[PDB]
Amino acid sequence: NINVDVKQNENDIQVNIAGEIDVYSAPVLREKLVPLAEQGADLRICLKDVSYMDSTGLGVFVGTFKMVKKQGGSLKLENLSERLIRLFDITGLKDIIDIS
Amino acid sequence: NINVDVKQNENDIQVNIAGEIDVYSAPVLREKLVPLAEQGADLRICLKDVSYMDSTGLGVFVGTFKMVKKQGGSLKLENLSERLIRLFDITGLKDIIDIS
Amino acid sequence: NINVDVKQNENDIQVNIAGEIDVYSAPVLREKLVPLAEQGADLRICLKDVSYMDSTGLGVFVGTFKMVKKQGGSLKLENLSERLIRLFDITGLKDIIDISA
Amino acid sequence: NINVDVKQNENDIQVNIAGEIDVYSAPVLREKLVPLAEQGADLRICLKDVSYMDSTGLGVFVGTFKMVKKQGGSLKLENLSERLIRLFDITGLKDIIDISA
Amino acid sequence: DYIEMKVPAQPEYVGIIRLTLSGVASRMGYTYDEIEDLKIAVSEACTNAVQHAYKEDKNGEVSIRFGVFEDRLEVIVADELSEGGLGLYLMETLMDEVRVQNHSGVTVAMTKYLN
Amino acid sequence: ADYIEMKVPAQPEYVGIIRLTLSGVASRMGYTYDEIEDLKIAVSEACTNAVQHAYKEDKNGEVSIRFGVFEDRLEVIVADEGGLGLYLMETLMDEVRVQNHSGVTVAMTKYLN
Amino acid sequence: ADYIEMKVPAQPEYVGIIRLTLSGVASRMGYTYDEIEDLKIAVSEACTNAVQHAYKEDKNGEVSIRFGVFEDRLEVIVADEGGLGLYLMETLMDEVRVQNHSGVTVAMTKYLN
Amino acid sequence: DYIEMKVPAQPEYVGIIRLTLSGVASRMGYTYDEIEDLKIAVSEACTNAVQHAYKEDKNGEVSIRFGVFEDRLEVIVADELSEGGLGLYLMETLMDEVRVQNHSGVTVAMTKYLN
């Protein structure tokens, strides 16, 4: 399943995601994190504990990025697998989203 | 169940009966031995191996006796339990049928 | 019913059982031979005249075996019909309890 | 799958088993340790890393025990999870095969 | 304690009741002769029921109840009438108490006391 | 088909009585000697489970038993944690069906050969 | 109710695969860890019986498995001399129903707590 | 050897297929990366079927067949159409062969070779 931990402090939000981001758990993730890019803010997403992801998770991550940009925010995704980074590469999204 | 062994030799018939003579097995016994008293003959019935009897067997034994007498035959029943003899006594049939 | 004849001689004991070992007569048996397996003695039980046995009788024998070995003793079961051996076989006890016929 | 590590030392042998003992991997096991129970040796089998076991794995252990005792040896099973002991308990084997945790 | 039996009113089954009966009578510890008499008396009550089903050409059923008490066995055979026979003589001679009542087919209630 | 019905209290004295009646029926139907001895074990197992079960609950219970005599088989129904006994019933009989919640109600059949 | 269906050949390699899928379902339904481990044993037992049975017949067989996910319980059906395994299925599950003659077809259920 | 699955076309069950798949892929001895890719590709094919059931508002079912061969795994997902997406890109990049055909809902046939 999936867990999401939001702790907003100082107008900058660290989010840790854990578990599986698939067709079943993606609307839950999108919903919990869709507005924070609708206001725009200083956003940090920790993908340390994601064990599975497909194009459904990639779709929401490009969805949050677009809103942070339309408008007024920052977005970093950090602590990614060697292969989660592989995945963002393979899909033409590595050089348009901040990855760590 | 019940078994009946007829061996007729010299116009005198030794019959050995074995098993249970009850409402279920009595028509079988009556049938196998009803005519031998309808002709009348020298008849011998060995009750050595009868393990159970009630008034249904007593009824056929008085039935065979009556026909041997109506007419022209002899009838002896031999090798009876202490209690098979008790039974023929208790029913008023001991002194009107030959028992051994 | 059931009869049980214990003859203790020289700290190793011969038991003869006769009749039916069913739910009704097994506590009678267990009671007669649980103390003997607390002794740790080497006991020989004669099943020649057992006419019937259940999972209840098996239970006392597998129970006796657990104690006899837990307190330094031996248990041998003799001399069983093929039907009695069938029952110990079907239940995985033929090579775990000494059986003879 | 399953891994089996036999370490024979001084005619008494330590075996470690890891993984799943199911219908598929039990013949692998039986094959690895049937000859060792024909030796009559006193063998100690470590079940710490068994993640799964069946009536098929029980069958090999009750099979090993029948031989180890039929040829003058000992068999001890160590050190089992409560789930592994549950399974030996549920099947009437807890006080008939040496178990520890 | 009350044991109950229900059998089809066919002659095969009387022999079955004698077994069940000797079962109870043994557990209560009657003699061999006492069990051998109980078997006769109970078959007799069952035979009237089986016979009475031929005349009606019914497919009937016999109900048998053993009431096992500390001092006696009570047997009730009911057949859900009486014209006295040799069989009814046998039940009375062999048992301590017999009580007959119709019209419920017939129901015979007989008793034997432990000695 | 013919139906023999029995009811006994859940006491151990009476299991042997059920075996007796059962061997009675099974003989008339012409089972093997060996087949009769398996019917006797299998039915005691079910009766013993209920007798055990009424003792454990401290219930005053009653066992109901129905022998169903058919052309090709015998059906025995016993109604009112079963262990080595339930194993035995399953190996020794052709069919076994267990169902709760009555205490338990067990249905076994063995086929005539 | 939702029905997951599986079909595998009666080979031993694939029993572990059925355990896996089953633990998958049983987790989503929120069974205990301890309850999942019993479902895993009980279903391997039924699969192992068919795999054994196809080897003994030298059949080329196939096992069909249906997980029935309900509001209060799980129903597992395995279809295609069962021994200690059939004992295990009966003690560890709430209901077991065995029927021939397909090879055998076994139906087990365990209730959610 | 052919393993077959049938699940309801709901999102809970895609995760189930990934398990079954990793089961097969392990028994065949693929890498971790090779299994981790196979899991993505098969979920993608299943997700199109699950999604396509929302639009139709059908209650549908996905059919999944693993064809396990000496040199390769063949996975067939059918949904008893295609407008290319990010997901279809992922299946092709990660797998050796992909073949798509409609109008049987859609059926996707993908292959991966053992290395």
Swiss-Prot record, chains A, B:
GO molecular function: anti-sigma factor antagonist activity
Mod. after translation: Phosphorylated by RsbW on a serine residue. Dephosphorylated by RsbP or RsbU.
SUPFAM superfamilies associated with the record: SpoIIaa-like
Phenotype when changing residue 55 to A: Loss of phosphorylation. Interacts strongly with RsbW
KW Phosphoprotein (keyword) present: yes
Effect of residue 55 to D: No interaction with RsbW
Record keywords, A-Z: Phosphoprotein
Domain STAS residues, every copy: 2-100
Phosphothreonine modified-residue sites: 56
Quaternary structure (record): Monomer. In stressed cells, forms a complex with RsbW. The predominant form of this complex has a stoichiometry of 2:2 (one dimer of RsbW is bound by two monomers of RsbV). Binds to RsbW in the presence of low levels of ATP or under conditions of energy or environmental stress (through dephosphorylation by RsbP or RsbU).
Function (record text): Positive regulator of sigma-B activity. Non-phosphorylated RsbV binds to RsbW, preventing its association with sigma-B. When phosphorylated, releases RsbW, which is then free to complex with and inactivate sigma-B.
Family listed: Belongs to the anti-sigma-factor antagonist family.
The protein's name: Anti-sigma-B factor antagonist
Organism of provenance: Bacillus subtilis (strain 168)
Upper lineage: Bacteria, Bacillati, Bacillota, Bacilli, Bacillales
Gene name of the encoded protein: rsbV
UniProtKB/Swiss-Prot annotation, chains E, H:
BP GO annotations: negative regulation of DNA-templated transcription
Induction conditions: By heat shock, salt stress, oxidative stress, glucose limitation and oxygen limitation.
Claim: ATP-binding is one of the keywords in the record: yes
SUPFAM superfamilies: ATPase domain of HSP90 chaperone/DNA topoisomerase II/histidine kinase
Taxonomy, superkingdom: Bacteria
One MF annotation (Gene Ontology) recorded for this entry: protein serine/threonine kinase activity
Gene3D superfamilies: Histidine kinase-like ATPase, C-terminal domain
Catalytically driven reaction(s): L-seryl-[protein] + ATP = O-phospho-L-seryl-[protein] + ADP + H(+); L-threonyl-[protein] + ATP = O-phospho-L-threonyl-[protein] + ADP + H(+)
EC number(s) given by UniProt: 2.7.11.1
Control of this protein's activity: The higher affinity of RsbW for RsbV than for sigma-B, rather than a difference in the concentrations of RsbV and sigma-B, is the driving force that is responsible for the switch of RsbW to non-phosphorylated RsbV. The kinase activity of RsbW is directly regulated by changes in the ATP/ADP ratio.
Keywords, in A-Z order: ATP-binding, Kinase, Nucleotide-binding, Serine/threonine-protein kinase, Stress response, Transferase
Pfam family, one: HATPase_c_2
Subunit text: Homodimer. In stressed cells, forms a complex with RsbV. The predominant form of this complex has a stoichiometry of 2:2 (one dimer of RsbW is bound by two monomers of RsbV). In unstressed cells, forms a 2:1 complex with sigma-B.
Family classification: Belongs to the anti-sigma-factor family.
Function text: Negative regulator of sigma-B activity. Phosphorylates and inactivates its specific antagonist protein, RsbV. Upon phosphorylation of RsbV, RsbW is released and binds to sigma-B, thereby blocking its ability to form an RNA polymerase holoenzyme (E-sigma-B).
Matching PANTHER family: ANTI-SIGMA-F FACTOR RSBW-RELATED (PTHR35526), SERINE-PROTEIN KINASE RSBW (PTHR35526:SF9)
NCBIfam families membership: PRK04069.1, rsbW_low_gc
Protein name: Serine-protein kinase RsbW
The gene coding this protein: rsbW
